[PDB]
Ligand binder design. Sequence first.
Ligand code: HEM
Ligand code: 5PF
Length: 371
Amino acid sequence: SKEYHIDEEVGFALPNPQENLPDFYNDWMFIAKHLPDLIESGQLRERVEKLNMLSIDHLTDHKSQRLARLVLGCITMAYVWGKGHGDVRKVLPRNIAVPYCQLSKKLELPPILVYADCVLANWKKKDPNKPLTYENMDVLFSFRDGDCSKGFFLVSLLVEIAAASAIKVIPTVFKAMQMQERDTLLKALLEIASCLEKALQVFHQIHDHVNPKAFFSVLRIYLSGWKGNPQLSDGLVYEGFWEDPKEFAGGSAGQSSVFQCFDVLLGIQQTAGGGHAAQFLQDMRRYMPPAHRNFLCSLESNPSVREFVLSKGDAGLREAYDACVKALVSLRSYHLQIVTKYILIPASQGGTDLMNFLKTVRSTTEKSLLK
Ligand code: HEM
Ligand SMILES: O[C@H](C[C@H]1c2c(F)cccc2-c2cncn21)C1CCCCC1
């Protein structure tokens, strides 16, 4: 891989994300790292409006720019949702709204917290000399004490990182088809199947670090957007940048590039046909970092791995390809069970539209098998 901002150790996630901003922005960093206290004490929204308007120009690097996106993205969800009990702000104050908006446009991302903010850039190792495992890692920002945002964000990230092992194999696959190296391609496909199988065990960590009640009744609220949302029917007003209200989707792992890229690699056309599911995953590419959505584009313009394997009448190649697809079905099926426990059952003591989305996506993946 190249300038697509993909790391051989960490994948689509951002290696060594920046923890501190320049001292120009302590009024921002102060609010973001005390979100639990300021929300509970009802002091958050006033401290948003007591801020003055800071320029973007002192955010020099890519890392500081993305950390500043994480900082302002969190404050925005906190300001808009408050303590998450239904009273919402519809006007985002200018002294935070235009710095957020100008920064979002420099990074080609929408002015709302996305996956690449709160997962791919929201982490750090405790001891930098020990490995990437849950016990040596922490998030940088949370919303409320007990919101399980750390468990939820880190376990996502750990799955993203398990998938990095398979991403570095992708160039091997295409070179092998181009150079007509069937044994090379067979081994490459088995290697990708093996990685997707290992990423399944990483999902099991979710049960030890997230509990359904807190996730459903707290974290979910701070991840909500203002598109198709009854509470903000027309969107949100970004003071002093636009005057119209604007609607942007809440956080979704449909914004994760790692499952989209394996759908594209294998020729599982998740974005084909005029269904809501295909529509939503295409729209969510606008909420990916431009470098990552460029990488999905260049995979799509390479010749299809699926029809290469079909064109050959090769049981070995067909079995290896189906191994990868079976492993994707396994992840989405385990993930579907997670959603039953963490959304469907809590909601019972909406969710059906979410299950139906995942089931459409799993059903498409299942239909891509050969034998
Ligand atoms: C408490 C744990 C989790 C819950 C309740 C949950 C729930 C959901 C829901 C409701 C969706 C619907 C689409 C959307 O709005 O994003 C979704 C999609 C998705 N989730 Fe999760 N999720 C959880 C954990 C994870 C983890 C750890 C990953 C690791 C990467 C992950 C990966 C995905 C992906 C890739 C999608 C897009 C659909 C697909 O490609 O199959 N999820 N999830
Ligand atoms: O699935 C998204 C949340 C999303 C998400 C983030 F917004 C941030 C970090 C990880 C994830 C995630 C992982 N799987 C789904 N999602 C929400 C949809 C509405 C119900 C609550 C979950």
